[PDB]
Design a protein around this ligand. Structure first.
Ligand SMILES: *[C@@H]1O[C@H](CO)[C@@H](O)[C@H](O)[C@H]1NC(C)=O
Ligand SMILES: *[C@@H]1O[C@H](CO)[C@@H](O)[C@H](O)[C@H]1NC(C)=O
Lengths: 439, 52, 439
């Protein structure tokens, strides 16, 4: 009926579960996680686009001086240079020569690339989870996405899929995050207003539509070269001219546990860490009576070749005596060895042949073959394969690991070799009787 | 009663009539006996008077 | 000064700050907080509004048994009732007699009344603190709305201020909070896909423009009784009606510190908690030397009458023979008494009246009247009036205030108390000299 399982958080590895109601014949089903996409909740702090330095056509006040108006522009700058020399096609521009002064002004504003090309310093926040699951529902694959929080129930094809909680809690992002157009970067930008020239924060705006452009250029003007009708300004390095070329390794590349990032909206996918539970309830439409199954008797497992590996760890033969024709389940009583075969149609009194997979040095275990029991034994061999492109959580172990026969080699050497200390123990009573040899 | 932070009362859609506690506190003297722990009976009653 | 102070977080309390610039003219300035705007995380989660129990037109299969058309509708329900009787104007709607069956179906959808009226299951955490502030500097009541987090510098008529950050980062909001058109409530709305039927929040769509509604409305279609042609069902619990019956304890009226709410976006307004640091900048342009300031001689402050209270709790006349003429400051130095008007004029041999407030009974007072420090003593009075609307934070004192005579009563009673240990030391020296002289 009800069946709650806690599968490990593994992207792209299936899981076989022994679903069974009390009274009927068991069944082995496959579920699989496909993606764990963690969507962070976001808020834009401020943006940064390219600026544009704009000057007027400056004022050539020949024969005198006219003081500028102290306007308020982002990096407004003004200077009336003295004794200037205006020049044009017919020699000097003004007939007045010596008392020619020149007002000059300069300012910086946004540029025209800020419509679609701009970075954005965001404040990142807590993450929202999302998960993808395909179940092979008795030879039928059906797939559904959800929240992996214990809090997202979906039901379709009598499958009350309610997940359990994300057993981890770790998010790969800090609040101080920046984003430009294909990527993100977790660094500490300066905040709005408190920016630094020649960096992130060389120019600061909240939104592109926010016209508060915190600018930092210090574009100090100079006297022109020799009668040259122009305005020279000073040094002002920016941020867009340098750090876009040296942002470097995007957070796609900086990701622990094999996280991956994905924009529109940005999200942390496929670092399946922790262990995800799923409660799934299934009615008696799936379970069938064991009398509809054959009672398999005289089972004997024979492994011609096992090899403790990540892939197909070995092959086995189950001598079985099914009473009739029927479809029934096979499920090993330990999680370590994994029969690749889940629901087998059996026919009679013969030898079926299956495979299995473990990294146990000798797989000695038990399988419920459809409410009947077989005990199995397999001397496994050293793995001759070297590199594998997929991880293997089906053959995975813990640390309480079992050898071929070296535990019996211990049993040789710990049929206690401290029994000579038990000889020392048995002479304790006789040496105490030597103390009692008078009284 | 009024706490030390005061009360804001509110009545219908109308203005929230806040009140801030007046520290009136006049039931003491100086006299021939003490009457200054009478001030400390007014200001901070029942505590900072067990201390003496 | 680059005078960085921390004023208490109280809207509408005139903080009188002191600028004794080094060897310059003293200058008292006023500040007044005007708003405290705290805006948490704008993370809308999902929605909840009214549904529509959609009952399509029933399907009377005249002399035939209709069969179930499985339609993937939210809370879809269908049943073909057998042995029905239809009728109309001219008797029976069917020529058929007893094999009249009638298909009947209904389901739930979203309502169109979610056009503008709905409820927002919504997430929020750390607020973007901003505040309004009016500074009175030399008859200049400048004002500024700045970001109260220590990031947004602001200069006004060259007066520079970085405001904030907030000392107490207390938040009146839960994460799972639901939003009505004027209000917000801390309540665990049921999570998406995993919502409870009939509770306020069964109807669940992701955005208000999203129509994909998970809902559980329990339409068990009843049989229409005998000959009447309609579609009775099990009744639908409408959560959205009594969403508004549980408005009740509004966050406008349940917030501590006298906090105010104003939704869309959600403003935590005027938290009376803690305090706030602030940088204060002005150049030396309003600063002449202390001798270029009018130097006061013949200084004497005297309190003629004072009832120490939340009103103007006292007044004092200062007689003086200043050096010369000038608008020079007045700063009370003892922190309980605060000067009501920050700067005065002086001319020379004059006297003038100041007003202030305190709560000390035997009030001691000390003042920096723009050249000199003058002490005043007083015996003020506790009030007898009862209603005061407005606070008075400056009058407030700590746990230790002076008495009028009982300091002398303390060191009369905690005066000779070591006379007993003096004669005890006499006991100890006589027992030592007799015990050692005899042995
Ligand atoms: C069904 O899924 C299993 C694993 O889940 C896969 O090996 C198989 O190819 C799928 N079959 C179909 C028909 O989709
Ligand atoms: C200036 O501000 C002070 C305190 O903030 C206030 O008492 C006064 O009325 C204001 N004056 C003007 C002209 O706004």
């Amino acid at each position: 009926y009800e069946h709650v399982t806690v599968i490990p958080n593994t992207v792209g590895v299936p899981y076989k579960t022994l679903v069974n109601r009390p009274g009927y014949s068991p069944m082995v089903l496959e579920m699989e996680l496909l993606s764990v996409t963690l969507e962070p909740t976001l808020s834009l702090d401020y943006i940064t686009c390219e600026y544009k330095t704009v000057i007027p056509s400056p004022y050539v006040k020949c024969c005198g001086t006219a003081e500028c108006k102290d306007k308020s522009l982002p990096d407004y700058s003004c200077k009336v240079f003295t004794g200037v020399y205006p020049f044009m096609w017919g020699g000097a521009y003004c007939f007045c020569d010596t008392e020619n002064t020149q007002l000059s002004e300069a300012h910086v504003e946004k540029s025209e690339s800020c419509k679609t090309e701009f970075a954005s310093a965001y404040r990142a926040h807590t993450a929202s989870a999302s998960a993808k699951l395909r179940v092979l529902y008795q030879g039928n694959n059906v797939t559904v996405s959800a929240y992996a929080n214990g809090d997202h129930a979906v039901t379709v094809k009598d499958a009350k899929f309610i997940v359990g909680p994300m057993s981890s809690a770790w998010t790969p992002f800090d609040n101080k995050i920046v984003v430009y157009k294909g990527d993100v970067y977790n660094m500490d930008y300066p905040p709005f207003g408190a920016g630094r020239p020649g960096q992130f924060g060389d120019i600061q705006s909240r939104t592109p539509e926010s016209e508060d452009v915190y600018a930092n250029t210090q574009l100090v003007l100079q006297r022109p070269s020799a009668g040259t009708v122009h305005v020279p300004y000073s040094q002002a390095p920016s941020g867009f001219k340098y750090w876009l070329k040296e942002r470097g390794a995007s957070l796609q590349h900086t990701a622990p546990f094999g996280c991956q990032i994905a924009t529109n909206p940005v999200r942390a996918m496929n670092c399946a860490v922790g262990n995800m539970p799923i409660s799934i309830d299934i009615p008696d439409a799936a379970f069938t009576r064991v009398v509809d199954a054959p009672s398999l008797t005289d089972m004997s497992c024979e492994v011609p070749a096992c090899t403790h590996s990540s892939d197909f760890g070995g092959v086995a033969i189950i001598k079985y005596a099914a009473s009739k024709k029927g479809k029934c389940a096979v499920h090993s009583m330990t999680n370590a060895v994994t029969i690749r075969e889940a629901e087998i149609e059996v026919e009679g009194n013969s030898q079926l042949q299956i495979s299995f997979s473990t990294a146990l040095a000798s797989a000695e275990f038990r399988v419920q073959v459809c409410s009947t029991q077989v005990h199995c034994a397999a001397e496994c061999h050293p793995p001759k394969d070297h590199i594998v492109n997929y991880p293997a959580s089906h053959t995975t172990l813990g640390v309480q690991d079992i050898s071929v026969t070296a535990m019996s080699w211990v049993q040789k050497i710990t049929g206690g070799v401290g029994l000579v200390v038990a000889v020392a123990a048995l002479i304790l009573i006789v040496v105490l009787c030597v103390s009692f040899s008078r009284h | 009663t009024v706490p030390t932070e005061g009360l804001e009362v509110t009545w219908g859609n109308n203005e929230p009539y806040k009140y801030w506690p007046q520290l009136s506190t006049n039931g003491t003297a100086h006299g021939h006996p003490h009457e200054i722990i009478l001030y400390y009976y007014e200001l901070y009653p029942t505590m900072t008077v067990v201390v003496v």
